[PDB]
Amino acid sequence: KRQVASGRAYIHASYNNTIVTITDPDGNPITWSSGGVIGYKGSRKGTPYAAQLAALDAAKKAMAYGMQSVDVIVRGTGAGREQAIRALQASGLQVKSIVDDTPVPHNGCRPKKKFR
């Protein structure tokens, strides 16, 4: 019960799971999805296909609010990161732009043993 029709689509990808969040122009979210949202549970959430289905689900849930214009924002590196964008373009939603915002530090914090 909103009728937004334009906004940003954030794709957060990792080697574990890929999630998607649709949002209004000033950044407040509308609907979202993920590999767990759909049937998949375990490591299966990391497959590109899961990313696809997730993008799709969030896309439909966006159609419900009458979303049309969508600006894609990508964060993280993971399998199906690109696949997510692929499905999102073919979602029927018109994608204005795509940007990679993936957060990187300036080397502030020491990471876990497996990250060094």
Partner RNA sequence: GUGGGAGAGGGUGGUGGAAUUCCCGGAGUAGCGGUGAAAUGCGCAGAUACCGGGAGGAACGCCGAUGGCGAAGGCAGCCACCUGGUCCACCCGUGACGCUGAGGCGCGAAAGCGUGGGGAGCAAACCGGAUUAGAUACCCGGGUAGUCCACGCCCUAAACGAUGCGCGCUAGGUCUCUGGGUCUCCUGGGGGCCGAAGCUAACGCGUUAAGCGCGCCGCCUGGGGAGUACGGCCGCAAGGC
Of 5-13, 29-37, 50-58, 97-105, the window that binds other proteins (rule: CB under 8 A) is 97-105
Residues 18-77 within binding reach of RNA (CB under 7 A) = 19, 21, 23-24, 26-32, 34-37, 41-46, 75
Considering the complex, state which of residue 97 and residue 105 has its C-beta at the smaller distance from RNA. 105
Q: Which of 10, 19, 33, 45 binds Mg ion (CB under 5 A)?
A: 45
Greatest C-alpha distance within the chain: 48
Contact yes or no for 73/101 (Cβ under 8 A): yes
Contacting residues for 69 by C-beta, under 8 A, at least 6 apart: 5, 6, 7, 94, 96
Residues that bind Mg ion (CB under 5 A): 16-17, 45
